[PDB]
Design a protein around this ligand. Structure first.
Ligand SMILES: O=C([O-])CC(=O)C(=O)O
Ligand SMILES: [Mn+2]
Ligand SMILES: [Mn+2]
Ligand code: NA
Length: 606
Protein backbone atom coordinates (compact mmCIF):
# COMPACT_ATOMS: atom_id res chain seq x y z
CA UNK A 1 0.00 0.00 0.00
CA UNK A 2 1.58 3.23 -1.27
CA UNK A 3 -1.21 5.43 0.16
CA UNK A 4 1.15 7.09 2.68
CA UNK A 5 3.29 8.36 -0.25
CA UNK A 6 0.59 10.14 -2.28
CA UNK A 7 1.19 13.92 -2.37
CA UNK A 8 -1.67 14.73 -4.77
CA UNK A 9 -4.93 12.88 -5.42
CA UNK A 10 -5.80 9.49 -3.95
CA UNK A 11 -5.17 5.87 -4.87
CA UNK A 12 -8.69 5.07 -3.61
CA UNK A 13 -10.32 7.34 -6.22
CA UNK A 14 -8.44 5.60 -9.07
CA UNK A 15 -10.29 2.94 -11.10
CA UNK A 16 -9.25 -0.57 -10.02
CA UNK A 17 -6.96 -1.27 -13.00
CA UNK A 18 -5.31 2.18 -12.89
CA UNK A 19 -4.55 1.71 -9.18
CA UNK A 20 -2.94 -1.71 -9.87
CA UNK A 21 -0.75 -0.16 -12.60
CA UNK A 22 0.39 2.70 -10.33
CA UNK A 23 1.00 0.55 -7.23
CA UNK A 24 2.63 -2.30 -9.15
CA UNK A 25 5.17 0.07 -10.69
CA UNK A 26 5.59 2.06 -7.47
CA UNK A 27 6.64 -1.24 -5.82
CA UNK A 28 9.14 -1.80 -8.64
CA UNK A 29 10.51 1.74 -9.14
CA UNK A 30 10.53 2.79 -5.46
CA UNK A 31 9.55 6.48 -5.91
CA UNK A 32 9.64 8.68 -2.79
CA UNK A 33 6.32 10.30 -3.69
CA UNK A 34 3.31 9.69 -5.93
CA UNK A 35 1.59 12.68 -7.55
CA UNK A 36 -1.65 11.96 -9.38
CA UNK A 37 -1.97 14.78 -11.92
CA UNK A 38 -5.19 16.77 -12.02
CA UNK A 39 -4.17 18.82 -15.09
CA UNK A 40 -5.15 22.09 -13.38
CA UNK A 41 -3.54 25.45 -14.12
CA UNK A 42 -2.29 25.73 -10.52
CA UNK A 43 -0.59 22.31 -10.73
CA UNK A 44 1.11 23.38 -13.98
CA UNK A 45 2.37 26.76 -12.70
CA UNK A 46 3.79 25.28 -9.49
CA UNK A 47 5.47 22.42 -11.38
CA UNK A 48 7.18 24.96 -13.69
CA UNK A 49 8.29 27.18 -10.79
CA UNK A 50 9.75 24.09 -9.09
CA UNK A 51 11.73 23.19 -12.21
CA UNK A 52 12.93 26.81 -12.40
CA UNK A 53 14.39 26.76 -8.86
CA UNK A 54 16.08 23.39 -9.45
CA UNK A 55 17.82 24.82 -12.54
CA UNK A 56 15.87 22.42 -14.79
CA UNK A 57 14.18 25.15 -16.87
CA UNK A 58 14.63 28.90 -17.39
CA UNK A 59 11.83 31.45 -17.71
CA UNK A 60 11.84 33.47 -20.94
CA UNK A 61 11.16 37.05 -19.85
CA UNK A 62 10.20 38.43 -23.30
CA UNK A 63 7.04 36.31 -23.46
CA UNK A 64 3.88 35.39 -21.56
CA UNK A 65 4.44 32.10 -19.67
CA UNK A 66 7.23 30.69 -21.89
CA UNK A 67 10.03 28.41 -20.73
CA UNK A 68 13.34 27.05 -21.99
CA UNK A 69 14.99 23.70 -21.29
CA UNK A 70 18.55 22.89 -22.35
CA UNK A 71 19.44 19.20 -22.37
CA UNK A 72 22.45 16.99 -21.83
CA UNK A 73 23.92 16.96 -25.40
CA UNK A 74 23.78 13.14 -25.24
CA UNK A 75 19.95 13.30 -25.02
CA UNK A 76 18.72 15.39 -27.96
CA UNK A 77 16.50 13.23 -30.23
CA UNK A 78 14.60 10.01 -30.83
CA UNK A 79 17.10 7.13 -31.06
CA UNK A 80 15.80 4.55 -33.53
CA UNK A 81 18.60 2.03 -32.78
CA UNK A 82 17.25 1.76 -29.21
CA UNK A 83 13.56 1.78 -30.15
CA UNK A 84 11.94 -1.67 -30.29
CA UNK A 85 8.72 -3.61 -30.59
CA UNK A 86 8.22 -6.90 -28.74
CA UNK A 87 6.02 -9.69 -30.13
CA UNK A 88 6.10 -13.49 -29.88
CA UNK A 89 7.06 -13.71 -33.56
CA UNK A 90 9.46 -11.33 -35.31
CA UNK A 91 7.51 -11.62 -38.59
CA UNK A 92 4.49 -9.96 -36.95
CA UNK A 93 6.56 -6.82 -36.27
CA UNK A 94 8.83 -6.61 -39.35
CA UNK A 95 8.90 -8.51 -42.63
CA UNK A 96 11.80 -10.94 -42.88
CA UNK A 97 14.25 -9.36 -45.39
CA UNK A 98 15.49 -11.36 -48.38
CA UNK A 99 19.08 -10.09 -48.28
CA UNK A 100 20.10 -7.69 -45.51
CA UNK A 101 18.82 -6.23 -42.25
CA UNK A 102 15.36 -4.67 -41.84
CA UNK A 103 15.01 -0.92 -42.29
CA UNK A 104 11.31 -1.17 -41.44
CA UNK A 105 11.45 -1.69 -37.69
CA UNK A 106 13.35 -3.29 -34.84
CA UNK A 107 12.08 -6.40 -33.09
CA UNK A 108 13.22 -7.63 -29.68
CA UNK A 109 12.16 -10.96 -28.19
CA UNK A 110 10.05 -11.14 -25.02
CA UNK A 111 12.94 -12.91 -23.25
CA UNK A 112 15.49 -10.27 -24.25
CA UNK A 113 13.21 -7.44 -23.20
CA UNK A 114 12.52 -9.02 -19.79
CA UNK A 115 16.27 -9.12 -19.09
CA UNK A 116 16.64 -5.54 -20.36
CA UNK A 117 13.72 -4.37 -18.15
CA UNK A 118 15.15 -6.05 -15.01
CA UNK A 119 18.51 -4.36 -15.68
CA UNK A 120 16.82 -0.92 -15.68
CA UNK A 121 13.60 -0.38 -13.72
CA UNK A 122 14.06 -1.84 -10.20
CA UNK A 123 14.64 1.10 -7.83
CA UNK A 124 14.98 3.57 -10.73
CA UNK A 125 12.81 6.31 -9.16
CA UNK A 126 14.39 6.27 -5.67
CA UNK A 127 14.28 9.76 -4.16
CA UNK A 128 12.03 11.05 -6.96
CA UNK A 129 8.34 11.70 -7.49
CA UNK A 130 6.34 9.32 -9.67
CA UNK A 131 3.86 11.48 -11.59
CA UNK A 132 0.69 9.74 -12.77
CA UNK A 133 -0.58 11.40 -15.98
CA UNK A 134 -4.06 10.43 -17.13
CA UNK A 135 -4.38 11.49 -20.76
CA UNK A 136 -6.64 11.21 -23.77
CA UNK A 137 -5.45 10.98 -27.33
CA UNK A 138 -8.24 12.75 -29.19
CA UNK A 139 -11.21 14.85 -28.06
CA UNK A 140 -12.43 13.48 -24.69
CA UNK A 141 -15.85 12.45 -26.02
CA UNK A 142 -14.68 11.09 -29.38
CA UNK A 143 -15.42 7.51 -30.50
CA UNK A 144 -11.96 7.64 -32.11
CA UNK A 145 -10.16 8.75 -28.94
CA UNK A 146 -7.99 6.43 -26.82
CA UNK A 147 -6.82 6.89 -23.23
CA UNK A 148 -3.40 6.30 -21.69
CA UNK A 149 -1.88 6.54 -18.22
CA UNK A 150 1.76 7.63 -18.21
CA UNK A 151 3.96 7.15 -15.15
CA UNK A 152 7.08 9.32 -15.16
CA UNK A 153 9.71 10.69 -12.80
CA UNK A 154 10.19 13.74 -15.06
CA UNK A 155 8.41 17.07 -14.42
CA UNK A 156 9.54 18.14 -17.92
CA UNK A 157 7.44 15.23 -19.28
CA UNK A 158 4.41 16.24 -17.15
CA UNK A 159 4.38 19.86 -18.36
CA UNK A 160 4.87 18.79 -22.00
CA UNK A 161 2.14 16.13 -21.76
CA UNK A 162 -0.32 18.80 -20.50
CA UNK A 163 0.26 20.63 -23.77
CA UNK A 164 0.56 17.67 -26.16
CA UNK A 165 -2.40 15.65 -24.80
CA UNK A 166 -5.67 16.26 -22.89
CA UNK A 167 -4.51 15.62 -19.34
CA UNK A 168 -5.92 15.41 -15.83
CA UNK A 169 -8.90 14.52 -13.65
CA UNK A 170 -11.56 14.69 -16.40
CA UNK A 171 -9.74 11.91 -18.26
CA UNK A 172 -9.81 9.66 -15.17
CA UNK A 173 -13.57 10.22 -14.83
CA UNK A 174 -14.09 9.51 -18.54
CA UNK A 175 -12.02 6.31 -18.47
CA UNK A 176 -13.91 4.62 -15.63
CA UNK A 177 -13.26 0.89 -15.82
CA UNK A 178 -12.35 1.11 -19.52
CA UNK A 179 -9.18 -0.08 -21.25
CA UNK A 180 -6.16 2.19 -21.40
CA UNK A 181 -2.64 2.07 -22.76
CA UNK A 182 -0.11 1.58 -19.97
CA UNK A 183 2.88 3.93 -20.35
CA UNK A 184 5.93 3.68 -18.09
CA UNK A 185 8.80 6.15 -18.28
CA UNK A 186 11.93 6.79 -16.22
CA UNK A 187 14.94 8.99 -16.91
CA UNK A 188 16.99 6.24 -15.20
CA UNK A 189 18.76 8.32 -12.56
CA UNK A 190 17.75 7.16 -9.08
CA UNK A 191 18.96 9.26 -6.15
CA UNK A 192 21.61 9.45 -4.85
CA UNK A 193 23.06 10.04 -8.33
CA UNK A 194 25.63 7.43 -9.39
CA UNK A 195 26.73 9.40 -12.48
CA UNK A 196 27.36 13.18 -12.90
CA UNK A 197 24.32 15.33 -13.70
CA UNK A 198 24.88 17.30 -16.90
CA UNK A 199 23.05 20.59 -17.57
CA UNK A 200 20.53 19.68 -14.84
CA UNK A 201 19.13 17.16 -17.33
CA UNK A 202 18.66 13.69 -15.89
CA UNK A 203 19.14 10.89 -18.42
CA UNK A 204 20.91 7.56 -18.91
CA UNK A 205 22.05 7.26 -22.56
CA UNK A 206 23.97 3.98 -22.07
CA UNK A 207 20.73 2.26 -20.99
CA UNK A 208 18.28 4.17 -23.19
CA UNK A 209 15.60 1.84 -24.57
CA UNK A 210 12.10 2.60 -25.72
CA UNK A 211 9.93 -0.49 -25.99
CA UNK A 212 6.41 -1.25 -27.25
CA UNK A 213 4.46 -4.35 -26.31
CA UNK A 214 1.28 -4.13 -28.43
CA UNK A 215 -0.18 -7.42 -27.21
CA UNK A 216 0.07 -6.20 -23.59
CA UNK A 217 -1.02 -2.61 -24.49
CA UNK A 218 2.17 -1.31 -22.83
CA UNK A 219 4.86 1.23 -23.74
CA UNK A 220 8.01 1.10 -21.58
CA UNK A 221 10.72 3.75 -22.00
CA UNK A 222 13.98 4.18 -20.07
CA UNK A 223 16.97 6.54 -20.12
CA UNK A 224 15.91 9.48 -22.28
CA UNK A 225 13.95 12.54 -21.14
CA UNK A 226 13.63 13.83 -24.70
CA UNK A 227 10.52 14.33 -26.83
CA UNK A 228 9.49 11.21 -28.75
CA UNK A 229 11.27 9.00 -26.19
CA UNK A 230 9.52 10.41 -23.12
CA UNK A 231 6.24 11.95 -24.29
CA UNK A 232 4.66 8.55 -24.75
CA UNK A 233 1.34 9.68 -26.29
CA UNK A 234 3.27 11.15 -29.24
CA UNK A 235 4.98 8.50 -31.38
CA UNK A 236 4.92 5.42 -29.13
CA UNK A 237 1.18 5.48 -28.60
CA UNK A 238 -0.22 7.59 -31.48
CA UNK A 239 1.70 5.75 -34.22
CA UNK A 240 3.32 2.49 -33.03
CA UNK A 241 0.75 1.11 -30.60
CA UNK A 242 -2.08 2.84 -32.49
CA UNK A 243 -1.15 1.46 -35.94
CA UNK A 244 -1.57 -2.02 -34.45
CA UNK A 245 -4.90 -1.26 -32.73
CA UNK A 246 -5.98 0.18 -36.09
CA UNK A 247 -4.91 -2.99 -37.94
CA UNK A 248 -7.00 -5.04 -35.46
CA UNK A 249 -10.02 -2.74 -35.45
CA UNK A 250 -10.23 -1.64 -39.11
CA UNK A 251 -8.99 1.97 -39.01
CA UNK A 252 -5.72 3.88 -39.74
CA UNK A 253 -3.04 5.55 -37.58
CA UNK A 254 -0.85 7.68 -39.83
CA UNK A 255 2.04 10.17 -39.83
CA UNK A 256 -0.25 12.76 -41.47
CA UNK A 257 -1.11 16.42 -41.14
CA UNK A 258 -4.78 17.29 -41.56
CA UNK A 259 -5.88 20.58 -43.10
CA UNK A 260 -9.21 22.13 -44.13
CA UNK A 261 -9.33 24.19 -47.31
CA UNK A 262 -12.12 26.50 -48.50
CA UNK A 263 -12.42 27.85 -52.05
CA UNK A 264 -13.73 31.32 -53.11
CA UNK A 265 -17.19 29.74 -53.50
CA UNK A 266 -17.53 28.59 -49.88
CA UNK A 267 -16.79 24.92 -50.63
CA UNK A 268 -14.61 23.27 -47.98
CA UNK A 269 -12.59 20.04 -48.22
CA UNK A 270 -10.32 18.29 -45.72
CA UNK A 271 -6.98 16.83 -46.85
CA UNK A 272 -4.36 14.66 -45.14
CA UNK A 273 -0.65 14.69 -46.05
CA UNK A 274 2.23 12.39 -45.13
CA UNK A 275 5.77 13.84 -45.49
CA UNK A 276 8.93 12.50 -43.78
CA UNK A 277 9.92 13.94 -40.37
CA UNK A 278 11.27 17.49 -40.88
CA UNK A 279 10.08 18.22 -44.43
CA UNK A 280 7.30 20.79 -44.04
CA UNK A 281 4.17 19.40 -42.39
CA UNK A 282 3.59 22.40 -40.10
CA UNK A 283 4.29 24.74 -43.04
CA UNK A 284 1.57 23.15 -45.19
CA UNK A 285 -0.91 22.61 -42.35
CA UNK A 286 -0.66 26.26 -41.28
CA UNK A 287 0.02 28.00 -44.59
CA UNK A 288 -1.39 31.37 -45.48
CA UNK A 289 -2.57 30.80 -49.07
CA UNK A 290 -1.54 33.41 -51.64
CA UNK A 291 -4.56 32.87 -53.89
CA UNK A 292 -7.38 35.33 -53.11
CA UNK A 293 -10.63 33.89 -51.72
CA UNK A 294 -8.92 30.72 -50.47
CA UNK A 295 -8.41 29.82 -46.83
CA UNK A 296 -6.51 27.03 -45.06
CA UNK A 297 -7.24 25.91 -41.49
CA UNK A 298 -5.24 23.48 -39.34
CA UNK A 299 -6.74 20.35 -37.78
CA UNK A 300 -3.36 18.76 -36.98
CA UNK A 301 0.30 18.85 -38.06
CA UNK A 302 1.68 15.36 -37.25
CA UNK A 303 -0.73 12.46 -36.60
CA UNK A 304 -4.06 11.41 -38.09
CA UNK A 305 -6.38 8.69 -36.85
CA UNK A 306 -8.85 7.77 -39.60
CA UNK A 307 -11.90 5.46 -39.72
CA UNK A 308 -14.54 4.98 -42.41
CA UNK A 309 -18.01 5.78 -41.08
CA UNK A 310 -21.29 3.96 -41.76
CA UNK A 311 -21.95 6.36 -44.65
CA UNK A 312 -18.55 5.50 -46.14
CA UNK A 313 -16.74 8.74 -45.28
CA UNK A 314 -13.10 8.62 -44.15
CA UNK A 315 -13.35 10.42 -40.81
CA UNK A 316 -10.17 11.76 -39.23
CA UNK A 317 -9.22 13.24 -35.88
CA UNK A 318 -5.99 14.80 -34.67
CA UNK A 319 -5.23 12.71 -31.54
CA UNK A 320 -2.90 15.42 -30.19
CA UNK A 321 -3.64 18.55 -28.13
CA UNK A 322 -0.64 20.62 -29.20
CA UNK A 323 2.22 21.06 -31.66
CA UNK A 324 5.71 19.67 -31.03
CA UNK A 325 7.38 21.28 -34.02
CA UNK A 326 10.99 21.58 -35.16
CA UNK A 327 12.10 25.10 -34.19
CA UNK A 328 14.91 25.97 -36.66
CA UNK A 329 13.61 27.26 -40.00
CA UNK A 330 10.39 28.59 -38.46
CA UNK A 331 9.99 32.25 -39.40
CA UNK A 332 7.46 35.01 -40.10
CA UNK A 333 7.90 34.37 -43.85
CA UNK A 334 7.94 30.54 -43.76
CA UNK A 335 5.26 30.02 -41.10
CA UNK A 336 3.70 33.23 -39.66
CA UNK A 337 0.84 31.29 -38.04
CA UNK A 338 3.29 29.12 -36.04
CA UNK A 339 5.04 32.28 -34.85
CA UNK A 340 1.69 33.63 -33.57
CA UNK A 341 1.04 30.26 -31.87
CA UNK A 342 4.34 30.13 -29.94
CA UNK A 343 4.21 33.65 -28.42
CA UNK A 344 2.62 32.42 -25.18
CA UNK A 345 2.24 29.31 -22.98
CA UNK A 346 5.03 27.50 -24.81
CA UNK A 347 7.98 25.30 -23.83
CA UNK A 348 11.14 25.53 -25.91
CA UNK A 349 13.87 22.90 -25.83
CA UNK A 350 17.46 23.39 -27.02
CA UNK A 351 16.97 26.77 -28.74
CA UNK A 352 19.06 29.93 -28.35
CA UNK A 353 18.10 32.85 -26.08
CA UNK A 354 18.56 36.57 -26.79
CA UNK A 355 19.59 39.07 -24.11
CA UNK A 356 16.06 40.52 -24.34
CA UNK A 357 14.87 37.11 -23.08
CA UNK A 358 13.61 36.02 -26.51
CA UNK A 359 13.99 32.80 -28.50
CA UNK A 360 16.41 32.38 -31.42
CA UNK A 361 17.35 29.73 -33.96
CA UNK A 362 18.81 29.12 -37.41
CA UNK A 363 16.52 30.54 -40.14
CA UNK A 364 14.29 32.58 -37.78
CA UNK A 365 14.69 35.51 -40.26
CA UNK A 366 14.61 38.20 -37.57
CA UNK A 367 17.44 40.75 -37.54
CA UNK A 368 18.37 41.78 -33.99
CA UNK A 369 18.69 45.37 -32.76
CA UNK A 370 22.26 46.59 -32.06
CA UNK A 371 23.39 45.58 -28.55
CA UNK A 372 21.31 42.38 -28.40
CA UNK A 373 23.55 39.36 -27.74
CA UNK A 374 22.78 35.61 -28.03
CA UNK A 375 23.22 32.59 -25.70
CA UNK A 376 23.32 29.25 -27.53
CA UNK A 377 21.60 25.99 -26.59
CA UNK A 378 24.90 24.90 -24.99
CA UNK A 379 24.58 27.85 -22.56
CA UNK A 380 27.47 29.82 -24.12
CA UNK A 381 27.75 33.21 -25.85
CA UNK A 382 27.16 32.95 -29.60
CA UNK A 383 28.05 34.95 -32.72
CA UNK A 384 26.42 34.94 -36.22
CA UNK A 385 29.73 33.84 -37.82
CA UNK A 386 30.56 31.14 -35.24
CA UNK A 387 31.39 27.49 -35.96
CA UNK A 388 28.34 25.94 -34.29
CA UNK A 389 24.59 26.57 -34.71
CA UNK A 390 23.00 28.53 -31.83
CA UNK A 391 20.13 26.04 -31.61
CA UNK A 392 20.33 22.25 -31.90
CA UNK A 393 19.18 21.07 -35.37
CA UNK A 394 16.54 18.98 -33.58
CA UNK A 395 15.41 21.70 -31.13
CA UNK A 396 11.70 22.11 -30.43
CA UNK A 397 8.73 24.20 -29.46
CA UNK A 398 5.83 22.62 -27.57
CA UNK A 399 2.71 24.77 -27.93
CA UNK A 400 -1.09 24.47 -27.37
CA UNK A 401 -3.03 23.73 -30.58
CA UNK A 402 -5.89 26.03 -29.51
CA UNK A 403 -3.48 28.99 -29.87
CA UNK A 404 -3.19 28.53 -33.62
CA UNK A 405 -4.91 31.57 -35.18
CA UNK A 406 -6.17 29.37 -38.05
CA UNK A 407 -7.05 26.31 -35.96
CA UNK A 408 -9.97 24.63 -37.71
CA UNK A 409 -13.36 25.05 -36.01
CA UNK A 410 -13.86 21.26 -36.18
CA UNK A 411 -10.37 20.39 -34.86
CA UNK A 412 -11.88 18.77 -31.75
CA UNK A 413 -15.19 17.65 -33.25
CA UNK A 414 -15.79 14.18 -31.73
CA UNK A 415 -16.91 12.71 -35.08
CA UNK A 416 -13.81 13.88 -36.96
CA UNK A 417 -13.48 15.59 -40.34
CA UNK A 418 -14.19 13.94 -43.76
CA UNK A 419 -10.97 13.32 -45.71
CA UNK A 420 -11.35 13.73 -49.48
CA UNK A 421 -7.68 13.54 -50.55
CA UNK A 422 -4.46 12.02 -49.26
CA UNK A 423 -1.11 13.52 -50.24
CA UNK A 424 2.27 11.79 -50.20
CA UNK A 425 5.48 13.74 -50.69
CA UNK A 426 9.26 13.74 -50.39
CA UNK A 427 12.37 15.81 -51.10
CA UNK A 428 13.48 14.90 -54.65
CA UNK A 429 15.97 17.27 -56.34
CA UNK A 430 15.48 15.48 -59.66
CA UNK A 431 13.07 13.48 -61.82
CA UNK A 432 9.83 13.77 -59.81
CA UNK A 433 7.25 16.39 -60.93
CA UNK A 434 5.62 19.04 -58.73
CA UNK A 435 2.38 17.06 -58.40
CA UNK A 436 0.76 13.96 -59.81
CA UNK A 437 -2.39 11.99 -59.07
CA UNK A 438 -2.57 8.23 -58.54
CA UNK A 439 -4.36 6.16 -61.21
CA UNK A 440 -6.43 4.18 -58.68
CA UNK A 441 -6.54 3.27 -54.99
CA UNK A 442 -4.09 0.39 -55.57
CA UNK A 443 -1.71 2.64 -57.51
CA UNK A 444 -2.03 5.22 -54.73
CA UNK A 445 -1.08 2.70 -52.05
CA UNK A 446 1.95 1.81 -54.25
CA UNK A 447 2.87 5.52 -54.49
CA UNK A 448 2.91 5.73 -50.67
CA UNK A 449 4.95 2.51 -50.50
CA UNK A 450 7.49 3.86 -53.02
CA UNK A 451 8.16 7.17 -51.20
CA UNK A 452 11.79 8.30 -51.13
CA UNK A 453 13.37 11.55 -49.89
CA UNK A 454 16.86 13.06 -49.75
CA UNK A 455 18.69 13.21 -46.41
CA UNK A 456 22.06 16.07 -48.30
CA UNK A 457 23.74 13.34 -50.36
CA UNK A 458 21.64 10.19 -49.86
CA UNK A 459 18.14 9.32 -51.11
CA UNK A 460 16.40 6.84 -48.82
CA UNK A 461 13.04 5.10 -48.59
CA UNK A 462 10.35 6.30 -46.19
CA UNK A 463 7.11 4.53 -47.15
CA UNK A 464 4.03 6.49 -46.02
CA UNK A 465 6.46 8.66 -43.96
CA UNK A 466 6.15 5.82 -41.43
CA UNK A 467 9.52 4.08 -41.64
CA UNK A 468 10.53 4.77 -38.01
CA UNK A 469 6.91 4.28 -36.86
CA UNK A 470 5.40 1.00 -38.18
CA UNK A 471 3.82 -0.83 -35.21
CA UNK A 472 3.75 -4.08 -37.18
CA UNK A 473 4.82 -5.85 -40.40
CA UNK A 474 4.96 -3.28 -43.27
CA UNK A 475 3.66 -5.89 -45.75
CA UNK A 476 0.57 -6.41 -43.56
CA UNK A 477 0.20 -2.60 -43.33
CA UNK A 478 0.14 -2.47 -47.16
CA UNK A 479 -2.50 -5.26 -47.16
CA UNK A 480 -4.45 -3.29 -44.57
CA UNK A 481 -4.46 -0.17 -46.81
CA UNK A 482 -5.46 -2.18 -49.89
CA UNK A 483 -8.38 -3.84 -48.02
CA UNK A 484 -10.16 -0.46 -47.77
CA UNK A 485 -11.12 -0.83 -51.46
CA UNK A 486 -13.21 -3.89 -50.54
CA UNK A 487 -15.12 -2.24 -47.70
CA UNK A 488 -18.73 -1.70 -48.88
CA UNK A 489 -19.75 1.92 -49.62
CA UNK A 490 -16.28 3.32 -48.80
CA UNK A 491 -15.64 6.67 -50.45
CA UNK A 492 -11.96 6.33 -51.26
CA UNK A 493 -10.02 9.61 -51.24
CA UNK A 494 -7.90 10.67 -54.22
CA UNK A 495 -4.19 10.09 -53.78
CA UNK A 496 -1.64 12.67 -54.86
CA UNK A 497 2.12 12.87 -54.73
CA UNK A 498 3.87 16.24 -54.36
CA UNK A 499 7.46 17.41 -54.69
CA UNK A 500 8.24 20.99 -53.59
CA UNK A 501 11.98 20.39 -53.96
CA UNK A 502 12.81 19.75 -57.64
CA UNK A 503 15.89 21.63 -58.85
CA UNK A 504 17.24 22.69 -62.26
CA UNK A 505 20.69 21.66 -63.56
CA UNK A 506 22.63 24.10 -61.33
CA UNK A 507 20.89 23.47 -58.00
CA UNK A 508 18.10 26.08 -57.92
CA UNK A 509 14.60 25.21 -56.71
CA UNK A 510 12.05 25.30 -59.54
CA UNK A 511 9.03 25.99 -57.34
CA UNK A 512 8.66 29.04 -55.00
CA UNK A 513 6.65 26.96 -52.48
CA UNK A 514 5.34 28.03 -49.07
CA UNK A 515 2.09 29.98 -49.57
CA UNK A 516 2.34 29.29 -53.31
CA UNK A 517 1.55 25.64 -52.61
CA UNK A 518 -2.10 26.79 -52.40
CA UNK A 519 -1.93 26.66 -56.21
CA UNK A 520 -1.22 22.92 -56.09
CA UNK A 521 -3.97 22.47 -53.48
CA UNK A 522 -6.42 24.28 -55.80
CA UNK A 523 -5.68 21.74 -58.54
CA UNK A 524 -6.25 18.82 -56.15
CA UNK A 525 -9.48 20.46 -54.99
CA UNK A 526 -10.76 20.60 -58.58
CA UNK A 527 -9.64 17.03 -59.32
CA UNK A 528 -11.60 15.83 -56.28
CA UNK A 529 -14.54 17.78 -57.78
CA UNK A 530 -14.12 15.98 -61.14
CA UNK A 531 -12.57 18.89 -63.07
CA UNK A 532 -11.26 17.83 -66.50
CA UNK A 533 -7.90 19.36 -65.60
CA UNK A 534 -5.60 16.33 -65.88
CA UNK A 535 -3.33 14.72 -68.47
CA UNK A 536 -2.39 11.02 -68.40
CA UNK A 537 1.30 10.12 -68.01
CA UNK A 538 3.09 6.81 -67.16
CA UNK A 539 3.43 7.83 -63.48
CA UNK A 540 -0.15 9.12 -63.04
CA UNK A 541 -2.22 12.21 -63.93
CA UNK A 542 -0.49 15.60 -64.02
CA UNK A 543 -1.94 19.10 -64.53
CA UNK A 544 -2.93 19.87 -68.14
CA UNK A 545 -1.25 22.72 -69.99
CA UNK A 546 -2.30 25.97 -68.25
CA UNK A 547 -4.35 24.05 -65.63
CA UNK A 548 -2.33 25.45 -62.71
CA UNK A 549 -2.93 29.03 -61.59
CA UNK A 550 0.52 30.57 -62.04
CA UNK A 551 -0.54 34.23 -62.06
CA UNK A 552 1.79 36.44 -59.99
CA UNK A 553 4.63 33.89 -60.13
CA UNK A 554 6.51 35.28 -63.14
CA UNK A 555 8.10 32.75 -65.50
CA UNK A 556 7.93 29.35 -63.76
CA UNK A 557 9.85 26.68 -65.69
CA UNK A 558 6.89 24.32 -66.25
CA UNK A 559 8.78 22.14 -68.79
CA UNK A 560 11.43 21.12 -66.24
CA UNK A 561 9.08 21.14 -63.22
CA UNK A 562 6.66 18.75 -64.93
CA UNK A 563 9.12 16.85 -67.10
CA UNK A 564 9.22 13.06 -66.95
CA UNK A 565 12.29 11.23 -68.24
CA UNK A 566 12.19 7.58 -69.36
CA UNK A 567 15.81 7.28 -68.24
CA UNK A 568 15.04 8.62 -64.75
CA UNK A 569 11.93 6.49 -64.33
CA UNK A 570 13.59 3.28 -65.56
CA UNK A 571 16.16 3.69 -62.78
CA UNK A 572 13.49 4.69 -60.26
CA UNK A 573 11.21 1.72 -60.85
CA UNK A 574 14.25 -0.58 -60.76
CA UNK A 575 15.19 0.87 -57.37
CA UNK A 576 11.72 0.46 -55.90
CA UNK A 577 11.57 -3.14 -57.17
CA UNK A 578 14.83 -4.13 -55.45
CA UNK A 579 13.85 -2.28 -52.25
CA UNK A 580 10.40 -3.94 -51.99
CA UNK A 581 11.80 -7.35 -52.90
CA UNK A 582 14.44 -7.12 -50.16
CA UNK A 583 12.57 -5.32 -47.35
CA UNK A 584 9.10 -6.72 -47.89
CA UNK A 585 9.94 -10.08 -49.51
CA UNK A 586 7.23 -12.70 -48.73
CA UNK A 587 4.75 -10.19 -47.24
CA UNK A 588 4.54 -7.99 -50.32
CA UNK A 589 0.90 -7.99 -51.46
CA UNK A 590 0.07 -9.14 -55.00
CA UNK A 591 -1.47 -5.80 -55.91
CA UNK A 592 1.72 -3.89 -55.02
CA UNK A 593 3.81 -6.21 -57.20
CA UNK A 594 1.15 -5.71 -59.90
CA UNK A 595 1.32 -1.90 -59.64
CA UNK A 596 5.09 -2.13 -59.87
CA UNK A 597 4.96 -4.34 -62.99
CA UNK A 598 2.39 -1.95 -64.53
CA UNK A 599 4.56 1.10 -63.88
CA UNK A 600 7.58 -0.70 -65.40
CA UNK A 601 5.44 -1.52 -68.44
CA UNK A 602 4.15 2.04 -68.92
CA UNK A 603 7.73 3.37 -68.69
CA UNK A 604 9.01 0.81 -71.23
CA UNK A 605 6.52 2.16 -73.82
CA UNK A 606 7.46 5.87 -73.69
O1 LIG B 1 9.75 12.71 -32.92
C1 LIG B 1 8.85 13.62 -32.65
O2 LIG B 1 8.04 13.53 -31.63
C2 LIG B 1 8.75 14.83 -33.55
C3 LIG B 1 8.13 14.51 -34.89
O3 LIG B 1 6.90 14.85 -35.18
C4 LIG B 1 8.99 13.77 -35.89
O4 LIG B 1 10.29 14.01 -35.93
O5 LIG B 1 8.42 12.89 -36.70
MN1 LIG C 1 6.23 13.51 -36.87
MN1 LIG D 1 -8.09 -5.67 -54.17
NA1 NA E 1 19.13 22.28 -18.46
Amino acid sequence: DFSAKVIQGSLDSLPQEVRKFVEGNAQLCQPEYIHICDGSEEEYGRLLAHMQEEGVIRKLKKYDNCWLALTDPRDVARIESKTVIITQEQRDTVPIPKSGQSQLGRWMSEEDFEKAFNARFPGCMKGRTMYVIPFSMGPLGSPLAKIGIELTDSPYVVASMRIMTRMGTSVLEALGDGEFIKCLHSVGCPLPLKKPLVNNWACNPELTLIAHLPDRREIISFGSGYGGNSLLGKKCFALRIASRLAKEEGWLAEHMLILGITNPEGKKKYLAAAFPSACGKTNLAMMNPTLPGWKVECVGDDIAWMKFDAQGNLRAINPENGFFGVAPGTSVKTNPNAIKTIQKNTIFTNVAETSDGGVYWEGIDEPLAPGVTITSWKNKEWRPQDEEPCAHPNSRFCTPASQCPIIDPAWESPEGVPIEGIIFGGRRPAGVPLVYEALSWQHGVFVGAAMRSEAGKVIMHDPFAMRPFFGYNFGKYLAHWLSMAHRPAAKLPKIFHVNWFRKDKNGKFLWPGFGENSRVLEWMFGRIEGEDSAKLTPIGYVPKEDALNLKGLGDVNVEELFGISKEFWEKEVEEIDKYLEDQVNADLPYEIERELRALKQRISQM
